[PDB]
Design a protein around this ligand. Structure first.
Ligand SMILES: O=C(O)c1cccnc1
Lengths: 291, 339, 233, 58, 224
């Protein structure tokens, strides 16, 4: 029906067919992501005898994805029990913060490795290519500071919203208002998408015009740059387009009738799982590749 | 009419010296030392790690205080380390970045260095000013310098890849003696503890024993199958060890003028970059190029232990005069001090 | 030959301000750490301020903290001491002292000529028993100085320095860390000490061996000197 | 005439090297054994030195 | 940690700072190794780029500093010091293309470019040089053009069809020198015919060096 949130008249339902498809999806995600991220972190922690900036950034990406998919199982249980998150108040804040901060970190580090590749390919002699490991550590800590600085507001709020008989633990909710959460999601998709697309296009154009693509290994690198672009789009475009659609019908129509939302809600959360695929799809493209 | 006769005479003399060598080989040191207990497994843990070089490290020498050490590297820098505290006393810039040898004066007042520029240059460490300056720049060798060792504050003897060892006088600046007996490039040097004799290992698979005061080859020791890369005296001074590409060490004796023992293993196939002894002579730290170093029982040829902390091949390693520690440089720009 | 020339001072009204400049050209200045040591008329030496190599570390004495400011200009090889609010007890001869710190160095090696300055009108303390001892030439003489706490450190070396001030001349270092005979002095001098009570021995006196002897600790700042010991032939 | 001089020098060097008196291998083995046993305890690299007497520590 | 030891540690830290500055300044420099038979027009290329021991040549083209080590002055064994140059961006191999009618004075039993062919074969598939690319310079273009009329290329290479023209003979020689590459999956060979204009050779060397640097950067990032 129509619920109520302070200063925000919201309406989010508990429709079925969300506990039969989403829990198995999240189970597969957690299994594969935990396995891949553990087998990736094993090399970095123990049997990697070198480092440098690019491996620093890949290690940070793996750390972010690892924390994300260890955060997954509680969210999986929350989906299983049909929005009945019966853990408390601190667990809600922690899980929402973990999910959002780790997604921001994954996206920011994807963008930064794309920019690193763009500098390494189009401007090989730029001073940013020759960057010290301490400088890389400072830059990565600064990036983590930027990531956290936009997300601590999920710790101040009382996340476990009690309504009717249920305990909602969802940061993504639809309300007749604009908050920094939705806007941050919008830029989270758009601006890194623009940077990644520009970097990939420039890399491809410079490599092809240099006519060095004839090498049997450059072709694999090009196809994996393309692959990383397409997987980024595949995991992030659906949820964002559903958010744009719900913004459109919220602006045009409003919240007078709450029954024009059901569909645009349900698939939304399903699309919301697509980005978690990135966590379980990053190891195959980023680390396990490039022999 | 004369070359053939001289060649036949030389062959006869070689056969005679081989027969004389075989005459005094009634017993063998390898079986004589079955009565003593084995040294057993020996564990050495890297106490320190001197970091700050950013290129290949090709040379290092231990000061007589057994606390300061100089290290050469291909970035053009010469660094004096304090082993106890791992801090840089000095950082000497070099005119040529292609140096492959370095040495420390026994008094600690001077340091030498040389390389592909075929010049062993002496740096004065203790000046009235605050910097280190080039005291002398010796020239006269034809091939790259592989080793120069300080006899004292005034004398130094160098070995170069022009099949020649030379003894210099630092004040005037020119060599006073020349040791031209080798056929291949001379690759290593080792002064006797009493500093009256020294052996040089060349590329002709032979090590020769010279006399500093006279200037003549006293003995020639053969038995290797490749170029000798490492030379080190026994602490007594009546023996020495050789290291070559055939993955084999060899202990020679001056008095009997023949080889005593060989240190070879089936699994080890790569050569040897540097060889040194212990304070008493029971150990033989031979630095191979399989990315680690090995330790041998010098009296029974038994592999006592290994030192496997380097991410590249070790190119130099020496033992402190007091016998406290062992430092090994490698190509990963990393120096490590063991115990 | 190293030199340390300095200019400044000569007369200051109380409560004024004056700047002292030190010039050391032709020899290394960036690597050396520089000190200021003052000596009131007919009184023992007193450390004033210290600046490290690269200007990255600056100390001041307790009685000058807040009123003095020591700075160096390595490109110009100059050392400064901005003095503010000068009292009537600041009248002293100020010395420029160089010191280099690495394993086996000899700090406080060279002292400047010293520039005078007249203003018109917890820490280890040392102790010297006597300030005037007459000894005939050719005889050995021993000078001993104690300390509040033992100067022997975990490093194994005890920090004690010996300086000799000839009549009308700058003090010169002859022994550092109680044992090492500083370069440039004869071998007749020798030093020894045990933790807290130290000494200095001269094999035989000479016409130029008479003067004032000071002993100084370098375990930790502020560096404390000792009362001078005058030797009369 | 360079080859002739080199051959003469090699022959003379070999002749001078031949005359050196050499003791038996067993004698030298015994001497090395005696030296290495007489300095067994003064070898910190051989027997582990106590950490108190070890100038190098972690 | 007394005052003396603290000052010593600060001195060491300053030493580290200066060492890091010098190393980062040196990492911006392209290190090139020049080899060849010695009488293969090496000096001409050296002087074009310029505008005992081992000679050093330094120059900048486009904000990029080139260091070129001329190692031909050493007559010792190559294997005894070739591992010194193991970390090098590229190797320049000047080849003279007008010495098939000339034989080496010392032996006179082998052709002049056959010695350079053996040198190239040894250098290309060395243990240390399994990654460094090789820049090939075929110097005596005009002499080849004016001399191929007198004698054909069949004398140096018996297994030749016998076109006896400059273009096909030059292609044959370039292909023969490229055929010595055994590790075709790790290193490339760049070939240029030395031109009269001195800017073109330097531009080609710059392009080869930037290709090597791009591939190294891709390998470091992982994509290669
Ligand atoms: O941040 C997320 O991905 C999220 C937020 C709320 C509910 N489910 C997932």
């Amino acid at each position: 029906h129509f619920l109520e949130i302070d200063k925000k008249n919201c309406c989010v339902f508990r429709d079925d067919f969300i506990v039969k498809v989403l829990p198995p999806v999240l189970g597969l995600e957690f299994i594969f992501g935990l396995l891949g991220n553990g087998l990736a972190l094993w090399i970095f922690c123990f049997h990697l005898k070198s480092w440098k900036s690019s491996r620093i950034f890949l290690f940070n990406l793996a750390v972010a994805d690892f924390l994300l998919i260890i955060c997954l199982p509680f969210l999986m249980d929350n989906y299983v029990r049909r929005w009945d998150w019966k853990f408390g108040d601190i667990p809600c804040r922690l899980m929402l913060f973990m999910l959002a901060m780790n997604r921001q970190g994954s996206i920011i580090f994807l963008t930064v490795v794309a920019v690193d590749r763009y500098f390494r390919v189009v401007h090989p002699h730029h001073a940013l290519n020759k960057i010290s490991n301490r400088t890389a550590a400072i830059i990565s800590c600064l990036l983590w500071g930027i990531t956290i600085g936009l997300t601590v507001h999920l710790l101040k709020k009382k996340m476990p919203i009690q309504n009717g008989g249920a305990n909602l633990c969802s940061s993504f909710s639809i309300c007749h208002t604009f908050q920094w959460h939705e806007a941050m999601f919008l830029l989270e998709f758009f601006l890194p998408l623009g940077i990644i697309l520009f970097c990939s296009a420039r890399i491809i154009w410079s490599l092809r015009q240099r006519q060095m693509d004839r090498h049997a290994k450059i072709k694999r690198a090009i196809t994996f740059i393309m692959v990383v672009a397409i997987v980024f789009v595949i995991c992030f475009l659906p949820s964002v387009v559903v958010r744009i659609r719900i913004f459109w019908l919220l602006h045009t129509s409003g919240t007078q009738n709450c029954e024009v939302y059901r569909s645009v809600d349900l698939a939304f959360f399903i699309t919301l799982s697509f980005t978690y695929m990135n966590s379980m799809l990053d190891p195959v493209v980023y680390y396990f590749s490039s022999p | 009419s004369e070359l053939d006769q001289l060649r036949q005479e030389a062959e006869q003399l070689k056969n005679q010296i081989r027969d004389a060598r075989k005459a005094c080989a009634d017993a063998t040191l390898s079986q004589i030392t079955n009565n003593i207990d084995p040294v057993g497994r020996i564990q050495m843990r890297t106490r320190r790690t001197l970091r700050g070089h950013l290129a290949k490290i090709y040379a290092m020498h231990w000061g007589t205080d057994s606390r300061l050490l100089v290290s050469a590297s291909q970035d053009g820098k010469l660094i004096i380390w304090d082993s106890y505290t791992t801090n840089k006393v000095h950082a000497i810039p070099l005119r040529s970045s292609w140096v492959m040898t370095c040495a420390y004066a026994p008094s600690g007042n001077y340091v030498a260095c040389g390389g592909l520029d075929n010049i062993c240059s002496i740096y004065n460490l203790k000046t009235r000013e605050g910097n280190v300056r080039v005291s002398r720049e010796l020239a006269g060798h034809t091939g790259y310098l592989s080793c120069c060792r300080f006899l004292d504050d005034n004398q130094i003897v160098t070995s170069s890849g022009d099949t020649t060892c030379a003894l210099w006088d630092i004040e005037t600046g020119q060599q006073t003696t020349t040791f031209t007996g080798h056929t291949g490039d001379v690759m290593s040097l080792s002064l006797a503890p009493d500093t009256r004799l020294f052996v040089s290992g060349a590329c002709d698979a032979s090590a020769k024993l010279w006399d500093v005061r006279e200037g003549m080859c006293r003995q020639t020791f053969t038995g290797h199958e490749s170029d000798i890369n490492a030379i080190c005296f026994f602490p007594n001074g009546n023996a020495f060890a050789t290291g070559s590409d055939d993955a084999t060490c060899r202990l020679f004796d001056l008095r009997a003028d023949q080889e005593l023992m060989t240190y070879s293993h089936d699994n080890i196939i790569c050569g040897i970059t540097s060889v040194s002894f212990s304070k008493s002579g029971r150990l033989l730290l031979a630095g191979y190029d399989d990315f680690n170093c090995n330790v041998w029982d010098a009296l029974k040829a038994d592999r006592a232990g290994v030192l496997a902390g380097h991410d590249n091949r070790v190119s130099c390693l020496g033992v402190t005069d007091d016998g406290m520690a062992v430092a090994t440089g490698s190509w990963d720009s990393f120096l490590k001090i063991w115990n | 030959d190293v030199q340390l020339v300095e200019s400044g001072g000569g007369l200051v009204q109380p409560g004024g301000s004056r700047k002292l400049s030190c010039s050391a050209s032709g020899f290394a200045f960036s690597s050396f750490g520089m000190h200021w040591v003052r000596q009131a008329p007919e009184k023992g030496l007193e450390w004033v301020a210290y600046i490290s190599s690269g200007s990255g570390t600056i100390y001041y004495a307790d009685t000058v903290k807040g009123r003095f400011t020591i700075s160096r200009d390595d490109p110009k090889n100059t050392l400064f001491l901005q003095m503010t609010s000068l009292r009537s007890e600041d009248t002293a001869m100020y010395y420029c002292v160089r010191s280099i710190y690495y394993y086996g160095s000899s700090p406080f090696d060279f002292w400047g000529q010293g520039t005078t300055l007249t203003v018109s009108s917890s820490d280890i303390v040392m102790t010297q028993a006597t300030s005037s001892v007459p000894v005939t030439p050719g005889e050995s003489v021993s000078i001993s100085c104690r300390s509040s706490k033992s100067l022997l450190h975990s490093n194994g070396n005890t920090y004690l320095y010996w300086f000799l001030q000839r009549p009308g001349q700058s003090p010169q270092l002859l022994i550092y860390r109680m044992s090492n005979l500083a370069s440039g002095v004869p071998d007749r001098f020798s030093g020894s000490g045990s933790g807290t009570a130290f000494t200095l021995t001269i094999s035989r006196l000479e016409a130029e061996d008479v003067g004032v002897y000071y002993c100084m600790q370098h375990l930790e700042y502020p560096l404390t000197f000792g009362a001078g010991t005058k030797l009369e032939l | 005439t360079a080859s002739i001089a080199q051959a003469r020098k090699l022959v003379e060097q070999l002749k001078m090297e031949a005359n050196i008196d050499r003791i038996k291998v067993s004698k030298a083995a015994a001497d090395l054994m005696a030296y290495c046993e007489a300095h067994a305890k003064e070898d910190p690299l051989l027997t582990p030195v106590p950490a108190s007497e070890n100038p190098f520590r972690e | 940690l007394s005052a003396e030891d603290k000052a010593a540690v600060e001195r060491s830290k300053m030493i580290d700072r200066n060492l890091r500055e010098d190393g980062e300044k040196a990492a911006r420099e392209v290190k090139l190794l020049l080899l060849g038979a010695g009488e293969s027009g090496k000096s001409t290329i050296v002087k074009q780029m310029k505008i005992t021991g081992i000679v050093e040549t330094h120059f900048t083209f486009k904000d990029l500093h080139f260091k070129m080590f001329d190692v031909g002055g050493q007559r010792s064994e190559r294997k005894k010091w070739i591992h010194c140059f193991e970390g090098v961006t590229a190797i320049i191999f000047c080849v003279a293309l007008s010495d098939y009618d000339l034989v080496l004075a010392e032996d006179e039993e082998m052709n002049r470019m056959h010695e350079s062919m053996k040198l190239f074969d040894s250098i290309c598939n060395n243990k240390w040089f399994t990654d460094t690319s090789i820049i090939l310079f075929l110097n005596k273009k005009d002499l080849f053009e004016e001399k191929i009329k007198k004698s054909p290329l069949t004398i140096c290479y018996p297994e030749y069809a016998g076109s006896n023209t400059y273009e096909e003979a030059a292609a044959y020689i370039q292909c023969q020198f490229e055929d010595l590459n055994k590790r075709k999956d790790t290193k490339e060979i760049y070939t240029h015919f030395t031109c009269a204009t001195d800017t073109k050779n330097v531009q080609f060397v710059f392009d080869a060096v930037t290709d090597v640097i791009i591939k190294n950067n891709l390998k470091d990032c992982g994509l290669f």
